[PDB]
């Protein structure tokens, strides 16, 4: 089975940067295709951060987000997300999601703790 590995929580320092780590573990014996990476605030439907296999990355919250691993022309496995200059208003749950075929969606909730 394809399985997302992430911590359940991540402490960051106000005004500092931090990375939300999110990784897809794909067995060698198993066959899969990942089409995109989607980040959102837990509950909400849409993408704060999205990386697509052909279109590359697209952050929507602002230029305070970055896909640290994902690159075009390379298999998508690491959806790790960097957030610059965190705000009290950044504390919350987040969802890292892998858009795979034929397994379907693999996702996790990561808690971001500011201060």
């Amino acid at each position: 089975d394809v399985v997302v590995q992430a911590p359940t929580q991540v402490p960051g320092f106000l005004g500092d940067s931090v990375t939300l780590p999110c990784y897809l573990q794909v067995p060698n014996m198993e066959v899969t295709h990942v089409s995109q990476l989607t980040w959102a605030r837990h509950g909400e439907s849409g993408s704060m951060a999205v990386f697509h296999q052909t279109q590359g990355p697209s952050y929507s919250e602002s230029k305070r987000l970055e896909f640290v691993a994902a690159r075009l022309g390379a298999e998508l496995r690491n959806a790790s997300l960097r957030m610059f200059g965190l705000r009290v208003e950044d504390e919350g749950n987040y969802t890292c999601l892998f858009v795979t075929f034929p397994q379907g969606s693999r996702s996790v909730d990561i808690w971001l703790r500011v201060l």
């Binding site: 295709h33 089409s35 995109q36 989607t38 959102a40 439907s45 849409g46 993408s47 704060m48 999205v50 697509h52 296999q53 279109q55 697209s58 929507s60 999601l97 858009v99 075929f101 034929p102 379907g104 969606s105």
Partner: protein, 103 residues
């Protein structure tokens, strides 16, 4: 930003067929992939590139289409309940529609 229409809340006859269907409007976003799922199960996927995949549990009693919609065959009371179409799109992300079935 964009809105999903569905076939809504519908009824059908034991042993008959039904179309499950969604439309994603009010947005230019590309559809990367559509997942047809119940709360804890994956019925199928229509991937723009790779095409259709049907879950083994539903393979012999389900047909792809029309379009991104899914056709349930030989309905059983067990097939009653919530269904979801999840659109995975760029650059918007994830859109979700609910359909309720009463067999």
């Amino acid at each position: 930003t964009g809105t999903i229409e569905t076939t809504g809340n519908i009824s059908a006859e034991k042993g008959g067929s039904i179309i499950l269907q969604c439309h994603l409007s009010s947005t230019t976003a590309q559809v990367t992939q559509v997942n047809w799922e119940q709360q804890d199960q994956l019925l199928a996927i229509c991937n723009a590139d790779l095409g259709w995949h049907i879950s083994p549990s539903f393979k012999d009693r389900v047909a792809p289409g029309p379009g991104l919609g899914l056709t349930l065959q030989s309905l059983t009371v067990n097939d009653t309940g919530e269904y979801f179409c999840i659109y995975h799109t760029y650059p918007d992300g994830t859109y979700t529609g609910r359909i309720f079935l009463e067999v």
